[PDB]
Ligand binder design. Structure first.
Ligand SMILES: *[C@@H]1O[C@H](CO)[C@@H](O)[C@H](O)[C@H]1NC(C)=O
Lengths: 98, 98, 311, 52, 49, 104
């Protein structure tokens, strides 16, 4: 199962920014213009529309991937082994892997 | 493919080169809110775990028992086994002595 | 020792982030939920929040928690810290930013705490499912049964190879730093911090001040003020504005990492078996949806797979 | 959602409650049957009881 | 028979001679725990209802 | 009279026994659940526990309960004695080892 990593967005007030490509799995980046975000302390930006938020996201392996994962294998002819238990005459049972 | 078994693939569980195929798409943030919304196809590994079906452990013919360490099929009752055993010469008693 | 697990968390602070439901409406919550991990089997979920648990101003103390109250960080004893999905959840342990809980299925995850007369909660939409182990769909861990391997989030706070990044906080907008004063906007700077300001009145002004500054504008609405305080770092949260440059400052380990464990699964009642010529008759009386599988031991397995929900 | 509606309050050591049978349903607005208001999505017109 | 209507039978409601046929099987106690676990076929009277 | 209903319960004590989900993890609980009777129609159930309700060391008092604290029996006034299944249950009455409640 995958995890999506989402870094802190870049909020540019009274200006604009641009997205760049990055070497991340399923990396996404987009700049949304005309934002007027608010924080606990009030309006974050001064300009009413000349502000942009650049969002980023990419896919990661989740923490569970270390224990909960499926392994895909190519299977070829290998070997055949057996455990054989043998007794004869007055000799008691003896066994070995063959 | 996204939402299917192989949407996320890694050559090994500790590699640093990950393949991911999900429709991860960044969505516009809600008005006045600083966050990074997105949509994505639900994990195909979780989907597969729901739709796995019967494992080989439950459908193998000839009564095979499937074990993993190492991967093997045990006690498959197929065919016959030629054998050759060299019995110690001390295990034999002469006819006139019996 | 216990303090050895908080060496890096002591370098991070709690923060206020957007919460989709602060009671009845969206707000900026000091207990905002960042992530809910619910992939363990027996209903165990791990919740990441913006609040810090186990630390006080004087050091490590598992009976204390810390959260932001505006620009000021507050430290209190844990009081009625709770988690709810569809019904009250039992708490297993807590660690900086993280809560480990034992929850029933539900469509939401609610986390909150009390601070004297104050109540702080955050509810997010998240499908929490109970995942039974094995061939029986039981709805609560049984008292007894067959012990099977399962995936669980451990209760240990130890560093187990999983980390998250803590970054230099971005600009924190705070309009309370501004006052009209003598009909001329003044900027108050908290001790040890710097305040970035941006004013666009007839005299357009901007800059960073380390002490109380009076600008040329006469209306607070004409100015913006941002608090710069990098003495404590924060998680690389997707709900916080990013700083400028390379803001990475360190790593924080994830406490309650998923581990392999043994879970007790239910054990269905013994079937009644009747025998007829070349026929096996089974009378199945399940307690929970129970999976029945069969196969022939010949060259054609002719497998059968069905879930038995009623007798 | 639920099958009953319970209302109550405390008066010192006393507790006064009243429970009535009443089916409460969640009504998602739109063409998707979500079970709790989303954090993000498409904003659609809906019916609400005002807080005023 | 277990799980069917007549799994539990008594000549009268106050009779001291009771017949019972359920697949009541004692299970091994969980490690370190003093208790008496068991499995049993759900009542056939409740099933009949 | 009410005292006549506790003449035999005055001779018994509470006990500590295994509870599969005592708190958040299996432990020996002083209020372990022995039986849940849920065959009544209108959602009313009867629960047998290891704790004693309505009895104190000084006599019968329905506002008090007794439980074992290790080897020592302690009698306390009932404080938020509660039952829940999927949501809070209304308590009807309590007596000795038994709790009567209406549950969803
Ligand atoms: C071999 O056979 C004897 C008698 O049948 C038995 O006691 C012994 O355990 C067997 N050995 C193995 C490895 O199964």
């Amino acid at each position: 199962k995958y995890k999506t990593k989402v870094p802190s967005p870049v909020v540019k007030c009274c200006g604009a920014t641009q997205c760049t490509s990055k070497p991340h799995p399923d990396y996404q980046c987009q700049v949304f213009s005309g934002v007027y975000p608010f924080m606990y302390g009030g309006a974050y930006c001064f300009c009413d529309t000349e502000n942009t938020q650049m969002s980023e996201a990419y896919v990661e392996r989740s923490e569970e991937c270390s224990i909960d994962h499926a392994k895909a294998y190519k299977v070829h002819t290998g070997t055949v082994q057996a455990m054989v238990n043998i007794t004869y005459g007055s000799v008691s049972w003896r066994s070995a892997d063959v | 493919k996204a939402g299917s078994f192989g949407d996320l693939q890694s050559r090994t569980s500790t590699s640093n080169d990950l393949y991911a195929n999900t429709n991860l798409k960044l969505q516009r943030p809600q008005a006045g809110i600083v966050h990074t919304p997105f949509t994505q196809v639900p994990s195909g590994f979780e989907r597969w775990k729901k739709d796995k079906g019967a494992p080989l452990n439950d459908v193998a013919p000839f009564g095979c028992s499937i074990a993993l360490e190492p991967l093997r099929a045990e006690n498959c009752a197929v065919g016959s086994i030629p054998i050759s055993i060299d019995i110690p010469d001390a295990a034999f008693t002469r006819i006139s002595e019996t | 020792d216990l303090d050895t697990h908080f060496t890096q968390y002591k370098l991070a602070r709690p923060y206020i982030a957007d919460c989709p439901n602060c009671g009845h409406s969206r707000c900026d919550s000091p207990i905002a939920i960042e992530e809910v991990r619910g992939d363990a089997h027996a209903g165990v979920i791990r919740i990441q929040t913006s609040a810090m648990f186990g630390l006080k101003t004087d050091g490590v103390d598992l009976a204390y928690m810390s959260f932001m109250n505006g620009k000021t960080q507050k430290s209190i004893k844990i009081d009625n810290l709770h988690v709810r999905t569809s019904a009250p959840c039992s708490l297993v342990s807590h660690h900086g930013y993280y809560i480990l809980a034992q929850c029933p299925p539900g469509d939401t995850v609610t986390v909150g705490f009390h601070d004297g007369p104050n109540r702080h909660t955050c509810t997010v939409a998240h499908k929490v499912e109970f995942r039974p182990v094995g061939r029986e769909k039981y709805r609560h861990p049984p008292e007894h049964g067959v012990e099977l391997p399962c995936n669980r989030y451990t209760h240990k706070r130890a560093d187990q190879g999983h980390y998250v990044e803590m970054h230099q906080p971005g600009l924190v907008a705070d309009h309370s730093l501004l006052s009209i004063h003598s009909a001329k906007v003044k900027i108050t700077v908290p001790s040890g911090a710097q305040v970035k300001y941006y004013c666009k009145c007839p005299d357009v002004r901007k800059g960073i001040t380390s002490s109380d500054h009076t600008t040329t504008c006469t209306d607070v609405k004409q100015c913006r003020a941002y608090l710069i305080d990098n003495k404590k770092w924060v998680y690389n949260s997707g709900r916080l504005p990013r700083g400028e440059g390379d803001t990475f400052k360190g790593k924080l380990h994830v406490p309650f990492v998923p581990v392999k464990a043994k879970c007790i699964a239910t054990l269905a009642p013994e079937p009644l078996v009747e025998h007829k010529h070349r026929t096996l008759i089974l009378h199945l009386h399940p307690d929970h949806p129970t999976l029945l599988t069969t196969r022939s031991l010949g060259s054609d397995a002719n497998p059968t797979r069905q879930w038995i929900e009623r007798p």
